[PDB]
Design a protein around this ligand. Structure first.
Ligand SMILES: Nc1ncnc2c1ncn2[C@@H]1O[C@H](COP(=O)(O)OP(=O)(O)OP(=O)(O)O)[C@@H](O)[C@H]1O
Ligand SMILES: Nc1ncnc2c1ncn2[C@@H]1O[C@H](COP(=O)(O)OP(=O)(O)OP(=O)(O)O)[C@@H](O)[C@H]1O
Ligand SMILES: [Mg+2]
Ligand SMILES: [Mg+2]
Ligand SMILES: [Mg+2]
Ligand SMILES: [Mg+2]
Ligand SMILES: [Zn+2]
Lengths: 608, 603
């Protein structure tokens, strides 16, 4: 199969010479494109007369309706679009596309060359004939007789400029996505482009290709491979320090991962608390709303308040209030709404089913209700914006308290691990009672033996033996509030090399323990996020308690800018990638999460 | 700054119209390219007269000596090369480059457009003149006064075709690397291109960029990101099942990682054993060479021989000989030579120094001698061919026996871990037999990584206790992980590496070969790979198994039906990630692994 595409200006004789590129074999098809100038119509007439003879191949003639003459650049873009659509239509494949640039304007010849370079062509050539067929033999061929004479006498020169392979993303473009409106007027078609779509599509493809090629060297240094298509200025902006106030919209639009969120600390005070109370199935059993004033300057107090006061700040919600089934349902639904409004894509929520169990509601019933409410909230949301929520069961140790709650939480987690295989799942346990009790560990071999994962939640104690025991005796895969890893360099090295994640909650850590804010240089009491990042630790930024901390995940990501002097937003993306890798997800959840993370928002402040 | 670049053909009045693109603003300097055809020299003299009467911007004319008229494609390529070199020379900055395609052949205008697209330009434009002049008033401007009248009458139409950014690689190209000669003839330069270097470089970079763009959609599934630059045919070849007979050279040329190699089982027989024995410092004390007949069909026996016979096959070397300082020295150098010849980039060699100690040589002396021999061998090797070697201490256990040797090896590893911090280091311990977690806490306290060796026991409790009671980061010969789905999922999710030795496993345990499809006793490599497990292929004992790392990588084709070469690269990447290396060693290993050999067949 072999077709020929030509552009013709005032000289019509190029086409009869053009078919002689292959000699006697000729072309299987011939197609011609011209402009609307009246000076070509007689040439069209002679072309038709020539085409009457030699009826071997199938012939056609087109013309651009809107291109009378080249008056400005707008005519050039119009002709470019029409020529591109004509090339796609009349030449479905580039392996048998032959393009002749002889006729037309010099701009038209350049456009034909560029179209061949873009969409591909089998051969591109230019026809030359010596001037010995004309008035006194001083002109090139102009009528049929001398055209045939030149054909028979081999008086034509062909410069095969060579094949053009085209670009990979433009070589598979199809004709009917960008159609032409051909009007048959005799044996010649007349074509016109309705829209401009093809030019913007090609320009976008070329810009994306240039951006990918520019950033191709640093593929491994980008946390998300989809960032190579970013323009170099956008990547330079990505490598600048994060701004807490200017980058609010960019962080807000980011797809995030939440790995440390307590269910019972969500609607602890305010409008959310009243909304949860108003949904109670038994309003007469609701305890009265206690008076729990917030510390002045909340959520950023003048001085840290400690873990005890921070726990007591969330007493209007939790064990007391979530024993109501309606309150529990409203709590789960509102937590999912909060997660959706923050563009979270994957969430792990910490729950205590035995804390909300009653005489008629076993812990299994409470766990089933929580999981079913979350699954229902997930299935209602469209998949493009759906946040996948998994569950972690907290096993809190009490100082001198009962061991029964821990044992039944472990058994509940073991059973719910294989009870549910799709949607919302119980993915592990949160051993949050490891402080002042363990510097007695046999309780958790059944957890390991069934494939449940373990995260150990620190208790404000500054010792490093607890972290050691969590890593090596509890086989923990994540660490909560491990803010003193740097004090033991060997422990920090072990945590980095074993791929153990560290869950950091900026607002909770600032409120409970306190760190200097807006210090120009890193000091001895600086937040350990940047030091952990430099040490090779997979660091996650979380919320801990949405209600008590009075801050969202976007707010924590923005506060890391004030806690860590000169942290870059590339490191924010790194934290998100670390969170995605540290999640207790399976192959399908991980695939969906990676698909969601690739859609990083485009910056709008790349102007300096 | 603004530089005007344009060509002239039979006509000359294109450029006097050309620098009027900005009108009264003008241009800082103008440069003109031209051919050697004699039919256009009057245009050249007209140009000279024009800029003699019109001073201001710098003027220059260049003519391609070897190009006169368009006859075939060779002249076109010659003009293209000369034009590209002249473009790089006259206009080094793309932000100050203006190109006009009004003059010359139509192919010349196409070449100017293509050069602007390739290298970038501030603006590409074409100037037109309405034909109203001449004696009949029906022809365009051709004389000087006609040009002046056209300028005054505003009969010039400029088609600003738009700016071109160029390509990222071609935007940085510099003139001196591709120079253009000049032979002055008055005020007109005469240029010529010496060779076709710039054209071939442009074609090669364009082909590579096209390959990158084609392979870009699907970069997440490539083990090495540098594989994108491979041609699509090469990637299609990569995704095809490995051939044990024809892919031997490609596998041999690969940079590899060795994680399970025993020092004492390298020169157990053959001429290599006698090469080691000849280097004894006290040859009179060498034990007599035992008669150890290899099983028929070695290294691929008819029936598996088990672990006892396999261990007894290497009785002519090890503790028998390497108590000799010279024998140990020769053993280490020959092992490093074998590693270099196999293109291994990172090796973890595991040894038992306390087995080699004597009355006068303590285990610490033996360990330091081993380390210094390997470090020296690494030192006389170029860094681009250097194989980095790290050490593992094997704390083997036996029925009853003595626990003193285990304590000595663990303490030795602890001390050596902080002794050396560059070059050859002691990176971990090997537990050949271990649930006795009481005496392995001190190495967790100091940050030593633990690899646990599975014995000839088809048990599942052992792997569980290795993962959770020993905190092992690698598992040796865990061939029955699939019998416990929970254990397989745990190993996959916790990132624990499984180190498989194809030839050793075939000789000791026995597996079907050349199966058409996966069966019940088929090798578990592909099943582990499909389950998300990080699997590494190693050699175990170089001397006893009588096979190299290349030989094991090729045997996996017979063991695993339909295993592709992408999976071989995946196992190499898994081994790189599973090493006990630090940041610098990991960086060097990743740099070495990015140089995958180019396939030689592809079809
Ligand atoms: N930031 C934290 N640091 C330490 N422990 C915490 C933190 N947040 C929560 N916990 C512990 O986790 C337990 C469970 O918290 P959650 O909010 O999910 O439950 P609850 O319904 O509020 O329970 P409670 O009866 O304790 O009020 C808390 O009781 C507390 O012991
Ligand atoms: N395939 C294997 N499986 C289990 N143990 C092995 C295997 N190969 C070697 N070993 C043992 O692991 C340890 C590694 O030490 P090394 O490779 O230097 O051997 P060695 O001390 O020279 O051997 P030996 O004294 O047994 O001949 C030795 O105790 C060796 O016997
Ligand atoms: Mg709470
Ligand atoms: Mg609470
Ligand atoms: Mg051995
Ligand atoms: Mg031996
Ligand atoms: Zn071994």
């Amino acid at each position: 199969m072999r077709i020929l595409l030509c552009s013709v200006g005032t000289s019509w004789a190029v086409v009869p010479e053009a078919m002689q590129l292959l000699g006697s074999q000729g072309f299987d098809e011939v197609h011609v494109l011209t402009t609307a100038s009246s000076k070509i119509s007689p040439g069209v007439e002679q072309l038709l007369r020539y085409f009457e003879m030699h009826p071997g191949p199938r012939f056609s003639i087109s013309r651009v309706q809107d291109f009378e003459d080249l008056r400005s650049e707008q005519d050039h873009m119009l002709f470019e679009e029409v020529l591109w659509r004509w090339l796609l239509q009349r030449a479905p494949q580039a392996a048998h596309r032959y393009i002749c640039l002889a006729g037309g304007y010099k701009t038209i010849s350049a456009a034909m060359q560029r179209a061949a370079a873009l969409f591909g062509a089998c051969e591109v050539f230019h026809v030359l004939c010596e001037p010995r067929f004309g008035p006194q033999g001083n002109r090139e061929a102009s009528t049929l007789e001398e055209v045939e004479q030149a054909i028979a006498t081999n008086a034509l020169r062909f410069v095969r400029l060579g094949p053009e392979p085209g670009w990979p993303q433009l070589r598979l473009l199809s004709a009917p996505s960008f159609p032409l409106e051909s009007t048959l007027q005799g044996p010649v078609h007349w074509v016109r482009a309705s829209d401009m779509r093809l030019r913007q599509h090609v320009e976008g493809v070329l810009e994306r290709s240039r951006h990918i090629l520019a950033a191709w060297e640093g593929i491994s240094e980008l946390p998300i491979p989809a960032l190579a298509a970013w323009p170099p200025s956008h990547l330079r902006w990505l490598h600048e320090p994060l701004d807490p106030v200017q980058d609010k919209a960019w962080v807000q639009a980011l797809p995030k991962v939440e790995l440390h969120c307590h269910l019972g600390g969500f609607a602890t005070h305010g409008e959310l608390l009243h909304k949860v109370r108003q949904e109670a199935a038994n309003p007469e059993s609701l305890p009265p709303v206690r008076a729990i004033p917030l510390p002045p300057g909340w959520p950023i107090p003048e001085e840290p308040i400690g873990l005890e006061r921070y726990m007591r700040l969330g007493d209007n919600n939790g064990s007391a209030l979530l024993k109501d089934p309606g309150c529990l349902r409203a709590q789960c639904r509102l937590l999912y709404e909060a997660l959706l409004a923050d563009h979270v894509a994957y969430a792990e929520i910490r729950c205590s089913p035995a804390n909300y169990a009653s005489a008629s509601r076993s812990p299994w019933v409470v766990l089933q209700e929580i999981r079913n409410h979350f699954q229902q909230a997930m299935e209602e949301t469209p998949e493009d914006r759906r946040c996948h929520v998994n569950l972690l069961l907290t096993a809190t140790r009490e100082e001198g308290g009962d061991r029964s709650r821990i044992a039944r939480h472990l058994a509940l987690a073991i059973t719910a691990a294989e009870h549910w295989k799709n949607g919302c799942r119980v993915v592990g346990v949160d051993l949050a009672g490891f402080e002042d009790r363990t510097t007695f560990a046999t309780d958790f071999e059944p957890v390991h033996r069934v494939g449940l994962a373990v995260t150990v939640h620190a208790g404000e104690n500054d010792d490093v033996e607890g972290i050691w025991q969590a890593v090596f005796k509890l086989s923990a895969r994540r660490l909560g509030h491990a803010l003193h890893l740097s004090r033991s360099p060997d422990l920090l090295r072990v945590v980095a090399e074993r791929g153990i994640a560290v869950e950091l909650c900026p607002y909770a850590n600032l409120q409970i323990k306190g760190f200097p804010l807006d210090e120009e240089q890193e000091g001895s009491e600086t937040y350990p996020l940047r030091g952990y990042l430099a040490a090779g630790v997979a660091v996650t930024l979380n919320t801990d308690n949405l209600g008590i901390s009075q801050a969202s995940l976007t707010d924590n990501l923005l506060l890391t800018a004030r806690l860590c002097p000169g942290i870059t937003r590339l490191e924010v993306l790194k934290t998100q990638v670390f969170a995605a890798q540290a999640a207790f997800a399976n192959q399908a959840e991980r695939k969906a999460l990676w698909a969601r993370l690739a859609q990083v928002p485009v910056p709008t402040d790349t102007e300096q």
